[PDB]
Ligand binder design. Structure first.
Ligand SMILES: CC1=C(CCOP(=O)(O)OP(=O)(O)O)SCN1Cc1cnc(C)nc1N
Ligand SMILES: CC1=C(CCOP(=O)(O)OP(=O)(O)O)SCN1Cc1cnc(C)nc1N
Ligand SMILES: [Ca+2]
Ligand SMILES: [Ca+2]
Lengths: 675, 675
């Protein structure tokens, strides 16, 4: 039949792509082609408009199987061709070895690191529910789309997927439909060696609905029926168990050897002949398959055409909501939204930057509807909920509503990170955030790195940033954390010193379209600085205290800027004139012009950095570094700072030693380099 | 009764400790005191010999509840006193705000980061099973101890605990007994807001046995009976559901407010009076409680005395095994074990360092019985299993035996990391390792940092270290990873360049007693270097190519050392004389004498670093840095190196620019500093 021919075409495109690269993963594509065919036939999408906001979304969580995804996208006429498939896994191609949303049209998210995609799917579904609750009206189903996720055994073993699946069940996300490739094989062989749990019983315990498809190698009727069944269960996410043979059709089907290496040439020949293809031909696309797939595309395009008319009618009936929705789909924030950002003067009281963050959120959440966010069980510590907002919960619980704006993630940092990526991936200008203690952002490193690679404007509200947290001690006190994330490409790591800098950090985080943000915030109170402003802090680094005859410049961040200012006073009593630079975000600073950067970190003067964390990275900006390269301590915070000599006198001593060390030496800016 | 008085004493010590610090967590200690009393009465331990190898182990996974643990240790006469409790959470005390195994006698592991302790308990239990299978004989139950773990809702939400619990169920670890503090409260309030899964059904799906104690606020008879029941189930780990009231007895019991802040003074008074204590007194220890606890200690000490006689008789009957066991309990490796390390010459073939690692393991596993390890579903890629070894599995599966040495962790990096910490914590000189791709060590950052803080000699076999892996692309290619772990205190991060350096890295990793190791290993082949040896590489950094008239020194690691040597040849054609330094472990190098380090990185010569990852950290050792500070690419590895100019010519160009940049400048070693 044409459906059978389509499945064979998908299988053989994937195998031929792996063969041409002599690299990649044929097994799961062979096993999942029937399901992919069935799911894409149920999905609404436009290959010519990948951003249609009411499309169904597909996520390949088992991203190594991407030859399957690329084959689907090619067959459906996305901006990806057979010539691109021939360049699978080749430098510079549109068909990289794992899917990248920045590079591959129709890849919603970046997968490959196992467990992430299913969590991203939870976030897409969460966003869809919130979006629909915000905009839909009687006779106006602006948003009614589904989220389809493929995942394998590896994703089910990764703890991040358990976190997200527990939360998705709690949140009753009935438009999420996930499909487990139950093939009983991973890299180490049979799942009997390491993965013998009753997966189905576990998913029932989370509150998911289950459909089992015992013969998913062939039974596309049952796969389609499973989707129909899942759509009837509106208050539970559904897991469809697809019992498949890895590498179905290969001589090596059902073995670990078919997971991750190209098939033998003779194996590919026998696949082709028994499915009615020419064993001498590669990359075959039967025109009847193209015709069948084009019929579905044409129907989907008529659905989108009707949606556009629905949206036009919505703007007539609901002019305010319609204009808001249009602005969001255009990727634009509200005009002058940033006038809501709080501004401080040096006469204002000292405030912890976690509390300054609460105040910012309180002012901007009512002004910017596309802001939603939550905390990983640290709401009263991170200060991430604006008073007067409701939680995102299914109304059936009585605890919130899907129109709510505040997410109770529970103690689930990694899934929070990956869910945030999915919310961003949904689109509609969502600017979403997640709170935890800075030291436990590290639990979510897998997802954070993907925020950076995927270019998603997510925000971590990362409080309790240092030894300044005090008594909880070294298991809670960051040392390496900022260095880790600053060393990752494309992460803005803001460590604001005061009220104006905290507003600048949020301005950056909310305006972002391609760069994730981490806001490192204090437990403890900090003074409002003389010389700070949103304008200057928006440059990422700026001269706080200018000293034209400086013997030294002290560059600092966060809580250490006030320390530097106090050290300047001690140094004056010692006959040493210092300037102070505040460097609230190294990435933003780096992106400024060379002339601007040199105005902050000039030639001809020694520069000392001060930050109560690792010294890694700081030589970009300084000649000498005063940091903390050992673990912390459990005690009252001021006593810890004294122990480690992060005091005005301790900074002054090191500044005086720095001046002495460069006496008689020629000093050029740390910004200079040989290449 | 005396038991009731003991429970009250525990509760009030914990509350008084929090009160004195005006900081910490009274709620879970109040709720868990009955269970703690009951469990410690069942446990075999010697407060005067915390390292008795056949002790039962206790782990407080909900480490914020540590005032409870400290109270137990004080009451039982560990090397921790009431005067230490009065210094809870104070700088320098033996009672830090979360338990630290390095500082607290009777703390087996370091907890506080949620989810870790239960996984550590899985590792202690895994080690006990392996140890017993190795040494026990008829009439000689050398090892028969249990592992008791307390955990809360937060631990159950963290994905790492799901990973470890799935694996523990698979491994049929019947000597593991965990207790869930089912109090329905976390920081954000009721668990109804975020954690509504059926925990018990989930644990049944993993293959755990369940006992439910409905009234764990009072029913110590039922808690004791639950332990007895768990001990009868020898082929399943057991979860005991302790239904408790958080803060039991407080005016604020059953609320989130009692989780994490000191009680009000009037609340403490009413607690005391209704439990028969003096409300004017703090830190009371009724002598009848001390007497009762001392009786149990005395009985346990007689059990250990008998165990010592059993061990003496074992050495008579099984002289070889007995001597091996004695050596392990003394903390000593086999005499001359390192003679098994492979040695290479420059005439030997090129080999990938992952394959060199396989060869090392093949030689040393038969020589050092305390080496065990595994991989997170990457055994045929990491090359972590020695041929001829058997997997650690319950014999009932037919897939291995508890005497086995190779662990199939599944796709569970984070739990693997925390399980490794538990295996190390068991003691008996275990030197254990875990394989994954370097980029996915980051999934386990929570546990890795705790390896460093806990001073455990665990080893990550972290292959596929760079863009050298090729086609899998940027989701798999480390950039920030080495900088992250090098910036963490107390992590040795070895990146060996060749066969001799790989043997040095293993010598360090296996000899370690207080420092975790990460071995960053290649997919791709590397040549054997002229000038390498185990002896020189053991210094962490060494001069590979000495050039007395050097215009520049190139410092490199791993795959980039051979690149530097090839660049030296290009530079000679340009009239530039270079030396080469290999820096296989920065931490080991840093620990060498100042004179040794200056002999490697002298004054008076520009130094360029080359490593195909982040430049962070490298200014410790170099004036200029050639690294990769952007994400990678999917393609054949040699083409990626060419794209980024990590070629002999590209390195030479940057070296020549470095020489030019320092013309007419005075250059001192990067090792010099002002303070
Ligand atoms: C183990 C591993 C794989 C097996 C999956 O096993 P599976 O899901 O059951 O896939 P399959 O049925 O065999 O096609 S892929 C890649 N990899 C390394 C890998 C490890 N860890 C992380 C976080 N991401 C990865 N990418
Ligand atoms: C959320 C959080 C806590 C609530 C636990 O909730 P729980 O386990 O149910 O504890 P409880 O019954 O209330 O005493 S403690 C500390 N903390 C921050 C915290 C967050 N993430 C990690 C990895 N470790 C932590 N330490
Ligand atoms: Ca599988
Ligand atoms: Ca709880």
């Amino acid at each position: 039949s044409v459906d059978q021919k389509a499945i064979s075409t998908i299988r053989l495109l994937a195998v031929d792509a792996v063969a041409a690269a002599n690299s990649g993963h044929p097994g799961a594509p062979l096993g999942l082609a029937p399901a992919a065919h069935a799911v894409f036939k149920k999905m609404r999408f436009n290959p010519k408009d990948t951003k249609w906001i009411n499309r169904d979304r597909f996520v390949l969580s088992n991203g190594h199987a991407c030859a399957l995804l690329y084959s689907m996208l090619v067959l459906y006429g996305y901006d990806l061709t057979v010539e691109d498939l021939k360049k699978f896994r080749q430098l510079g191609s549109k068909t990289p070895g794992h899917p990248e949303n920045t590079d591959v049209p129709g890849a919603e998210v970046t997968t490959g690191p196992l467990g992430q995609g299913i969590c991203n799917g939870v976030g897409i579904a969460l966003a869809q529910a919130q979006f629909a609750a915000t905009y839909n009206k009687p006779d106006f189903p602006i948003s009614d789309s589904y989220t389809y996720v493929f995942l394998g055994d590896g994703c089910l073993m990764e703890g991040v997927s358990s976190e997200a699946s527990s939360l998705a069940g709690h949140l009753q996300l009935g438009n999420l439909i996930a499909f487990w490739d139950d093939n009983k094989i991973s890299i180490d062989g049979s799942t009997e060696v390491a993965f013998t749990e009753d997966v189905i019983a576990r998913y029932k315990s989370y509150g998911w609905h289950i459909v089992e498809v015992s013969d998913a190698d062939t039974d596309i009727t049952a796969i389609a029926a499973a989707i129909d069944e899942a759509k009837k269960v509106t208050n539970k996410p559904t897991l469809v168990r697809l019992t498949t043979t890895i590498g179905f059709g290969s001589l090596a089907q059902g073995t670990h050897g078919v997971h991750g290496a190209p098939l033998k040439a003779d194996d590919i020949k026998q696949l082709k002949t028994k499915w009615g293809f020419n064993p001498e031909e590669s990359f075959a696309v039967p025109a009847e398959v193209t015709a069948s797939y084009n019929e579905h595309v044409a129907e989907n395009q008529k659905i989108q055409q009707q949606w556009n008319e629905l949206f036009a009618a919505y703007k007539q009936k609901y002019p305010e909501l319609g204009a808001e929705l249009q602005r969001r789909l255009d990727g634009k924030l509200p005009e002058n939204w940033d006038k809501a950002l709080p501004v401080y003067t040096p006469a204002d009281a000292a405030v912890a930057t976690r509390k300054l963050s609460e105040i910012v959120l309180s002012k901007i959440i009512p002004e910017v509807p596309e802001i939603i966010g939550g905390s990983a069980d640290l709401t009263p510590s991170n200060l991430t909920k604006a008073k007067g907002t409701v939680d995102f919960q299914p109304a059936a619980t009585g605890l919130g509503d899907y129109s709510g704006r505040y997410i109770r993630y529970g103690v689930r940092e990694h899934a929070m990170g990956a869910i945030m990526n999915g919310i961003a991936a949904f689109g509609a200008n969502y600017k979403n955030y997640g709170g935890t203690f800075l030291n436990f952002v590290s639990y979510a490193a897998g997802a954070v790195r993907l925020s950076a690679l995927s270019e998603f404007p997510i925000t971590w509200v990362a409080t309790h940033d240092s030894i300044g947290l005090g008594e909880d001690g070294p298991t809670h006190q960051p040392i390496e954390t900022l260095a880790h994330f600053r060393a990752t490409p494309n992460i803005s790591v803001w460590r604001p010193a005061d009220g104006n800098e905290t507003s600048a950090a949020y301005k950056s985080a909310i305006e972002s379209t391609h760069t994730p943000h981490i806001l490192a915030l204090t437990r403890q109170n900090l003074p409002q600085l003389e010389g700070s402003s949103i304008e200057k802090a928006s440059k990422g680094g700026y001269t706080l205290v200018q000293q034209d005859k400086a013997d030294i410049i002290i560059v600092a961040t966060g809580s250490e800027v006030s320390l530097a200012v106090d050290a300047l006073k001690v140094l004056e009593g010692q006959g040493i004139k210092a300037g102070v630079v505040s460097l609230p975000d190294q990435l933003t600073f780096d992106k400024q012009s060379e002339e601007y950067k040199l105005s902050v970190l000039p030639d001809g003067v020694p520069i000392l950095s001060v930050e109560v964390m690792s010294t890694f990275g700081w030589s970009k900006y300084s000649h000498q570094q005063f940091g903390l390269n050992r673990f912390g301590a459990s005690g009252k915070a001021p006593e810890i700072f004294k122990l480690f000599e992060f005091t005005p006198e301790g900074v002054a001593e090191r500044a005086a030693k720095t001046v002495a060390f460069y006496k008689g030496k020629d000093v050029v800016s740390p910004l200079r380099s040989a290449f």
